[PDB]
């Protein structure tokens, strides 16, 4: 029944694509002419967070914007006081190949994941003085790519084995599993409500999931190469996909189709990270063009560059309040870029 | 403000510890293995991620990467090894008589490695893996089974001069990347002391570049 099911599946694609075309009368770029462009956003490197001695692979901010955790290839998960350029802690990492770090919403816990496929979780506010690991999370046969805490006792992890999984750190075993991808999953972004999350894979497919069950709520296509960055919209019903094809694509959960593209003729560099501001109006994405080109998300027009890095802008993310953006790049440093008055 | 002074002092202490860790981190090499599942790199390390084999040969700790079990798309995670002293590649010398394809994926991957935007300066080392078996294979069968344009001559020296040269012709950056070559002889020292010599050479070149000579 190969062709028999293929015909029905093609009918399904035709119906859903026709529904998308009927709902999407035109691209949102045309309809956004009402809102004013943000203009050239000059972001001075207010604090240069020097002190990290390798390529910054993932920077994360606790729910209080003061603290951040920056992960690099040197195996130094270092908690930083972005207010005074102070190192609250310097956690050694078991695996130095971390490509993702996470600050727990409580703030008591920090996790790092990467090649070893275990998302070790660390105890920050202990009775004693030091910061200790709580429990590692083994069970992934690929390479771990993005941990994001849901609560204090639930770690979401997308790996390179084309699957993703929810965990319970009290026991150490996966409560659910999310296998719907064909290529290695690169970026998993958790929603503000953490009831859903989106993970992007190397097959140019981004798939929304439901945390409670484990069934693929949606799938997304449109990219022409491997997706390298996904981060939810503050509204929690969107995300953006920066792929190695030198573009980024904005999606929607209720529309199930691509909306915008963030490419230009003069850029042929692949995106290595993506983040949003508090209002989502700025979609700061770290190109491998050695400049964290701030892409106006609502306009898909480059309305700012934060070129201050000697190497490719590997990771970056706004804080909880968005007062800072730390484009810690493959250059050893992190810079706190804030709008100067 | 006294608490802030104490916090600043604690941060300066953490800076002192971070620099002491980072000097060792910069001192550590990042020798990356690569190849196929049938390459047989297990032999090299004989004497669910990376098995980061940290050893020490000449008072310089070497962090080898048995990342051959990744079983993933290397194009999406090989950029994590941009800064390494060297890259060890165990060649698929099984093309003499064993097929499946007589080790043309070796060339298919070596060309990608050489032309990769991140391995311009990374002096990749080429190791003739399964050399002992490949010598008998080439003595018992010719080489033109899957290399029609080659000479072969059914000799160990010509087998290298053909197979290795096939990939070294794909090697384009002859000025920046200094590829070494050592036939993998199953011995106690000459299998890893040559790697030590090569990493010392590449570290010397990188040090000269950094100092500006």
């Amino acid at each position: 029944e190969l062709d028999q099911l293929r015909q029905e599946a093609e009918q399904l694609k035709n119906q859903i694509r026709d529904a998308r075309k009927a709902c999407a009368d035109a691209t949102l770029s045309q309809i956004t002419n009402n809102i004013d462009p943000v203009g050239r956003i000059q972001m001075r490197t207010r604090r240069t967070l020097r002190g990290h001695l390798a390529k910054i692979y993932a920077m994360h901010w606790g729910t209080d914007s003061r603290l951040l955790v920056s992960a690099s290839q040197d195996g130094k998960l270092i908690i930083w006081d972005s207010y005074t350029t102070n190192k609250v802690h310097a956690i050694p990492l078991r695996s130095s190949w971390v490509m993702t770090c996470a600050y727990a919403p409580s703030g008591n816990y920090v996790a790092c994941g990467g090649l070893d496929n275990i998302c070790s979780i660390y105890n920050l506010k202990t009775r004693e003085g030091n910061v200790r690991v709580s429990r590692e999370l083994a069970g992934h046969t690929g390479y771990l790519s993005c941990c994001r805490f849901l609560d204090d006792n639930q770690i979401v992890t997308s790996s390179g084995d084309t699957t993703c999984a929810l965990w319970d750190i009290e026991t150490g075993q996966q409560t659910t599993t999310f296998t719907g991808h064909t290529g290695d999953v690169m970026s998993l972004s958790l929603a503000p409500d953490t009831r859903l999350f989106v993970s992007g894979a190397c097959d140019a497919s981004a798939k929304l999931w439901d945390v409670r069950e484990g069934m693929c709520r949606q799938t997304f296509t449109g990219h022409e190469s491997d997706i390298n960055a996904i981060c939810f919209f503050p509204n929690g019903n969107a995300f953006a996909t920066g792929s190695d094809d030198a573009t980024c694509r904005l999606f929607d959960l209720r529309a199930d189709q691509e909306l915008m593209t963030y490419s230009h003729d003069n850029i042929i560099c692949g995106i290595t990270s993506v983040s949003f501001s508090k209002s989502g109006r700025l979609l700061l994405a770290g190109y491998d063009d050695f400049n964290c080109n701030v892409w106006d998300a609502l306009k898909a027009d480059r309305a700012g560059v934060l070129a201050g890095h000697d190497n490719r802008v590997s990771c970056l993310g706004v804080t909880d309040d968005g007062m800072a953006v730390a484009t810690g790049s493959w250059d050893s440093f992190l810079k706190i870029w804030n709008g100067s008055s | 403000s006294a608490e802030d002074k104490a916090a600043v002092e604690r941060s300066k202490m953490i800076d002192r510890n971070l620099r002491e860790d980072g000097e060792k981190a910069a001192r550590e090499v990042k020798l990356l293995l690569l190849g196929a599942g049938e390459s047989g790199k297990s032999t090299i390390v004989k004497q669910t991620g990376i098995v980061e084999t940290h050893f020490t040969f000449k008072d310089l700790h070497f962090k080898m990467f048995d990342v051959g079990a990744q079983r993933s798309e290397r194009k999406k995670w090989i950029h994590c090894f941009e800064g390494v002293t060297a890259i060890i590649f165990c060649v698929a010398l099984s093309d003499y008589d064993l097929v499946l394809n007589r080790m043309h994926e070796s060339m298919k991957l070596f060309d990608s490695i050489c032309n990769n935007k991140w391995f311009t300066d990374t002096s990749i080392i080429l190791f003739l893996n399964k050399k002992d078996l490949f010598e008998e294979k080439i003595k018992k069968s010719p080489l033109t089974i899957c290399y029609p344009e080659y000479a072969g001559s059914n000799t160990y020296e010509e087998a290298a001069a053909y197979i290795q040269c096939q990939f070294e012709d794909l090697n384009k950056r002859k000025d920046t990347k200094e590829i070494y070559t050592h036939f993998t002889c199953s011995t106690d020292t000459k299998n890893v002391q040559f790697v030590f010599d090569a990493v010392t050479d590449v570290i010397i070149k990188n040090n000269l570049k950094d100092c500006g000579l």
Partner: single-chain antibody
Amino acid sequence: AVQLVESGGGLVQPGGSRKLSCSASGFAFSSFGMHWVRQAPEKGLEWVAYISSGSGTIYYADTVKGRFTISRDDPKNTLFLQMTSLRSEDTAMYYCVRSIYYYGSSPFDFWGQGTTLTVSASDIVMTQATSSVPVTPGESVSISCRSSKSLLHSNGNTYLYWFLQRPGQSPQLLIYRMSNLASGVPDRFSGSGSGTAFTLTISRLEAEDVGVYYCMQHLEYPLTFGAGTKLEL
């Protein structure tokens, strides 16, 4: 299993010298700054020595400035204090304290059991008035000690450390600084204030709630300890 026990002293001849030592266990003391709190019998507390996290900024009190010396053995997790030419005023009970200094840390949280020393016979101070207002365990009591200057700094952290010296053992950190609660304390012991006013809002009292409270000041260089109080049963 955090354990702070100190030994050394108990009887001092006039014009003599004595040695103090505090033993720390159950926590990363090497990354912890430590204070030193004396306690005259039937009186309040008094700070005598201090060394920062990593032996950085050694401090001393004016009353024993030069006479005393404080040093930490971080690898051995033990404290060393030498007191020479002790005067008659040095008839008091000591209390080893720990402190970690970072963003939102827990300073002066754990106090040592205590070692008493007996000898035969320009800065800010706080008002430990209202010597006793005893109340039945079914009521609430608010305590306070006043400071001349505004406590809040540009950082906003106001240091009016709250403690409760229960009879027989060391005070327990109720609220380090003046805004944030402590580890192990219940929800009853609270605190609030605005600049110079403060209110140690305590919800309910029981058998353990008895004891004389005390306050510390960490804003200026000298840690003027709190004056004697009564359990106000």
